[PDB]
Amino acid sequence: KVVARVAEARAEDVGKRVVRVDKAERAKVGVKVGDVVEVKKV
Amino acid sequence: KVVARVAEARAEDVGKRVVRVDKAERAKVGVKVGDVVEVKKV
């Protein structure tokens, strides 16, 4: 799996169904900005 | 599943194995800040 540590949202991002992921993780997951992902408990 | 739209990282967050998730999504996923999650292609 592609695994990451959870951090809180920036203030301007509060209230969005959005996750901010840097380009290296996006490349490992196989997604681009705008794509939909599942965020799943490990 | 708990599903979210992918957005790019803020500049200060580039190069981290971190995903920023707001409190509502953290509550739905069942995790707290510092927890490890999987980010999975849908």
Side-chain angles (χ1 to χ4, degrees), chain A residues 1-26 28-42, chain B residues 1-26 28-42:
Chain A
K1 329 181 169 176
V2 186
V3 153
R5 287 262 176 203
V6 173
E8 75 179 335
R10 304 289 197 106
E12 310 100 300
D13 295 326
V14 168
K16 305 174 181 174
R17 255 76 42 199
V18 168
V19 289
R20 287 197 180 257
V21 184
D22 86 0
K23 196 196 256 260
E25 266 60 61
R26 294 201 303 278
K28 295 166 196 168
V29 177
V31 294
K32 291 177 161 273
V33 172
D35 288 343
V36 162
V37 291
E38 171 175 21
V39 178
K40 196 200 295 202
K41 184 164 217 170
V42 159
Chain B
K1 329 181 169 176
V2 186
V3 153
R5 287 262 176 203
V6 173
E8 75 179 335
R10 304 289 197 106
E12 310 100 300
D13 295 326
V14 168
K16 305 174 181 174
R17 255 76 42 199
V18 168
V19 289
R20 287 197 180 257
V21 184
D22 86 0
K23 196 196 256 260
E25 266 60 61
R26 294 201 303 278
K28 295 166 196 168
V29 177
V31 294
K32 291 177 161 273
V33 172
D35 288 343
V36 162
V37 291
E38 171 175 21
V39 178
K40 196 200 295 202
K41 184 164 217 170
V42 159

